[PDB]
Amino acid sequence: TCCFECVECPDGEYSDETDASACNKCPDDFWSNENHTSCIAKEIEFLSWTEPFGIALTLFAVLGIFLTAFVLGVFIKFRNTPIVKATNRELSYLLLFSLLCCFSSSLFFIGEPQDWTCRLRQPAFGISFVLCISCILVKTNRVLLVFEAKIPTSFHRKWWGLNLQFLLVFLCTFMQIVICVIWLYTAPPSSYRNQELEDEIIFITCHEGSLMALGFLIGYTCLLAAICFFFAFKSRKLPENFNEAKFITFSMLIFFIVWISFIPAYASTYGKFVSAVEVIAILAASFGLLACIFFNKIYI
Amino acid sequence: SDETDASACNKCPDDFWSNENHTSCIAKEIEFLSWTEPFGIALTLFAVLGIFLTAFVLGVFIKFRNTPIVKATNRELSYLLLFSLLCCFSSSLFFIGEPQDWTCRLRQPAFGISFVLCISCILVKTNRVLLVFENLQFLLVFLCTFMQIVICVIWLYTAPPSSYRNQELEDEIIFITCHEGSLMALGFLIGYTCLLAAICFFFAFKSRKLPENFNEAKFITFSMLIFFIVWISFIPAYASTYGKFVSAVEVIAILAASFGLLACIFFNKIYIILFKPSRNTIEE
Ligand SMILES: CCCCCCCC/C=C\CCCCCCCC(=O)OC[C@@H](COP(=O)(O)OCC[N+](C)(C)C)OC(=O)CCCCCCC/C=C/CCCCCCCC
Ligand SMILES: CC(C)CCC[C@@H](C)[C@H]1CC[C@H]2[C@@H]3CC=C4C[C@@H](O)CC[C@]4(C)[C@H]3CC[C@]12C
Ligand SMILES: C[C@@H](NCCCc1cccc(C(F)(F)F)c1)c1cccc2ccccc12
Numbered sequence: 001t002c003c004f005e006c007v008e009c010p011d012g013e014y015s016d017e018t019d020a021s022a023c024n025k026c027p028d029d030f031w032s033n034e035n036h037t038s039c040i041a042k043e044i045e046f047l048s049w050t051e052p053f054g055i056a057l058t059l060f061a062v063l064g065i066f067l068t069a070f071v072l073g074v075f076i077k078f079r080n081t082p083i084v085k086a087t088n089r090e091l092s093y094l095l096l097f098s099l100l101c102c103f104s105s106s107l108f109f110i111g112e113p114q115d116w117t118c119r120l121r122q123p124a125f126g127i128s129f130v131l132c133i134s135c136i137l138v139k140t141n142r143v144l145l146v147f148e149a150k151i152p153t154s155f156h157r158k159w160w161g162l163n164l165q166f167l168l169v170f171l172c173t174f175m176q177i178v179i180c181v182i183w184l185y186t187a188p189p190s191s192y193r194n195q196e197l198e199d200e201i202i203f204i205t206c207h208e209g210s211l212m213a214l215g216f217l218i219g220y221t222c223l224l225a226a227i228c229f230f231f232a233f234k235s236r237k238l239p240e241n242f243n244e245a246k247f248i249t250f251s252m253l254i255f256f257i258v259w260i261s262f263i264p265a266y267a268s269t270y271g272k273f274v275s276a277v278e279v280i281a282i283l284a285a286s287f288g289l290l291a292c293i294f295f296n297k298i299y300i
Numbered sequence: 301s302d303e304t305d306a307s308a309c310n311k312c313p314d315d316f317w318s319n320e321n322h323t324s325c326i327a328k329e330i331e332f333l334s335w336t337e338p339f340g341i342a343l344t345l346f347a348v349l350g351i352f353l354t355a356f357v358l359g360v361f362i363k364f365r366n367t368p369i370v371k372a373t374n375r376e377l378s379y380l381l382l383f384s385l386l387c388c389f390s391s392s393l394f395f396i397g398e399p400q401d402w403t404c405r406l407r408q409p410a411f412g413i414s415f416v417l418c419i420s421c422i423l424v425k426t427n428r429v430l431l432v433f434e435n436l437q438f439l440l441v442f443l444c445t446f447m448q449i450v451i452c453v454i455w456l457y458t459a460p461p462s463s464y465r466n467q468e469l470e471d472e473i474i475f476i477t478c479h480e481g482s483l484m485a486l487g488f489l490i491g492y493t494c495l496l497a498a499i500c501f502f503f504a505f506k507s508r509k510l511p512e513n514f515n516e517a518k519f520i521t522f523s524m525l526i527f528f529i530v531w532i533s534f535i536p537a538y539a540s541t542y543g544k545f546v547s548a549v550e551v552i553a554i555l556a557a558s559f560g561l562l563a564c565i566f567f568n569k570i571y572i573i574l575f576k577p578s579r580n581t582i583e584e
């Protein structure tokens with residue numbers, strides 16, 4: 001026994017005595033040093049505000065808010081010009097508010113995840129986007145109907161006349177407000193500290209809990225997109241001051257392009273870049289919508 | 301360790317890992333985008349559909365070839381464009397399977413050459429303001445393709461691509477990938493393929509309002525815009541996919557833009573020739 005050899009301790013075990021005779025296991029929430037001589041605390045990785053990437057996504061999502069505010073100001077100052085009144089000046093306003101809601105949803109992906117944030121992350125963006133899609137769809141059908149008129153109108157009360165314009169949007173949004181409510185009560189999302197995947201790093205993420213709702217939401221938000229194009233296809237022969245086809249088929253194509261190009265990184269990679277690409281995709285879709293439709297007219 | 305009373309635990313050879321019970325060594329697992337994975341059948345099926353669609357289109361044009369609509373445009377340039385499009389979808393098929401030595405070399409240049417050829421046809425055709433200064437069209441197309449052919453060759457001499465057999469991503473899993481030789485050649489290839497498309501997109505914007513052949517310039521600028529949007533997005537997707545989905549991202553991007561050039565420029569005229577035979581040297 002007086003004669004022995006020296007062998008290094010394996011990963012995650014340390015020693016601090018002269019003749020160890022055994023490797024002491026590192027305590028929980030700690031990891032061995034480079035030389036296996038003293039345990040050190042692990043590292044927690046999440047999309048924080050200290051790194052410039054976080055400072056960046058935030059400094060975009062303020063520029064978008066400012067641009068949307070500027071656009072709504074023209075439609076409020078020049079609220080009686082023929083081309084502004086050409087597009088629905090009611091439903092055009094409601095859309096702008098929905099776009100404001102859209103830019104904001106992204107700021108719920110920055111910072112340490114918590115229960116309420118993880119629960120409110122997806123439904124807000126889904127509701128806002130479907131609200132915008134419903135606004136576009138109802139506006140388009142009204143003009144086709146106005147311009148498919150054989151014999152004159154018969155609306156019996158002017159005010160209720162504009163009730164249809166607003167209630168159809170709520171009817172469209174009702175299906176996803178339902179799905180969001182039943183989902184949240186029957187299995188709410190919750191936070192989950194994961195340390196199994198990599199030994200030295202603790203990951204803080206959320207947990208979907210029930211995944212079947214995440215398929216129905218995509219199916220619905222997408223089905224509506226298939227309707228925006230068809231109506232966009234049907235609305236190609238109208239005159240210029242009212243035409244809105246090119247814009248519709250480019251915005252939804254951008255949406256599909258981004259959210260189908262970003263599938264594999266989301267499917268494979270784990271960690272902080274998933275949230276990064278989600279934020280960048282949301283921002284890309286929202287700008288795409290805003291400048292496809294409202295900017296030509298804001299130039300004119 | 302195998303037997304009883306082991307003084308020390310033997311390491312395992314580099315081509316193996318160790319069983320859950322640490323008793324003995326088993327074989328490592330090699331991962332790569334295969335032809336049987338459920339996520340590659342969709343890509344194979346999608347492509348085959350594109351190939352069949354291109355074959356059908358070249359059918360109608362070389363069958364109803366004695367009509368004013370097809371003769372209004374140049375037939376030779378249409379054949380060249382259809383041939384280039386047929387090679388893009390087929391090229392994508394070169395991005396799926398076990399990476400061999402020669403495949404890594406033929407991955408990029410084939411698509412680059414095909415896309416340069418297809419873009420060059422549209423350029424020689426945008427409202428003839430380009431062609432007014434000044435058969436000549438074939439010479440210009442050959443000159444456009446030759447600079448990409450040359451850059452490919454100097455590159456294959458000075459650094460060919462080959463397999464890597466990476467072992468630094470997953471200790472248990474062996475990754476088979478391609479090492480893309482040098483970066484200057486790839487950067488120059490991308491720069492040229494984008495610079496040509498930029499010029500094509502501009503003159504056509506410029507000539508977007510001329511209603512020649514059912515306003516074909518507008519569809520060309522639509523296709524160019526689609527191509528940019530698709531590839532500006534390729535940046536973050538690939539920059540954050542780590543594993544065996546880089547090939548998937550590349551295939552998805554290539555398939556999108558190929559359909560982008562085929563559909564825009566062809567489907568309106570395909571509909572006109574096949575149905576409603578009422579336009580003959582009047583609306584053409
Ligand atoms: C890496 C990411 C990849 C993601 C995949 C994306 C693939 C999509 C890209 C490309 C393939 C097809 C693209 C074709 C684009 C159409 C161009 C366009 O903009 O159209 C022009 C409009 C406007 O015409 P105008 O009013 O100015 O002229 C009026 C003149 N006068 C009065 C004579 C009539 O005319 C019209 O017909 C408008 C009718 C709307 C056209 C429908 C768009 C077809 C989309 C097909 C695929 C979409 C789903 C993708 C699959 C993934 C599912 C998740
Ligand atoms: C893969 C396929 C199905 C994607 C969709 C392609 C087809 C359906 C789309 C893409 C571009 C579209 C065309 C865009 C512009 C015009 C000009 C207009 O005066 C007639 C309709 C027409 C000709 C559209 C017909 C439908 C069209 C050809
Ligand atoms: C933001 C997203 N929730 C995470 C989906 C991750 C994903 C990553 C990459 C691709 C895809 C998708 F394209 F397959 F959806 C999903 C979301 C929530 C709610 C509604 C949505 C409607 C449209 C798009 C996204 C929606």
Ligand SMILES: C[C@@H](NCCCc1cccc(C(F)(F)F)c1)c1cccc2ccccc12
Nearest residue numbers: 408409411412483486487489490493531550
């Ligand atoms: C298929 C595609 N090459 C993708 C790999 C790019 C890359 C992969 C890995 C590293 C680097 C980097 F080194 F440049 F960053 C770049 C391609 C091929 C040919 C022409 C093309 C023209 C336009 C767009 C894409 C083209």
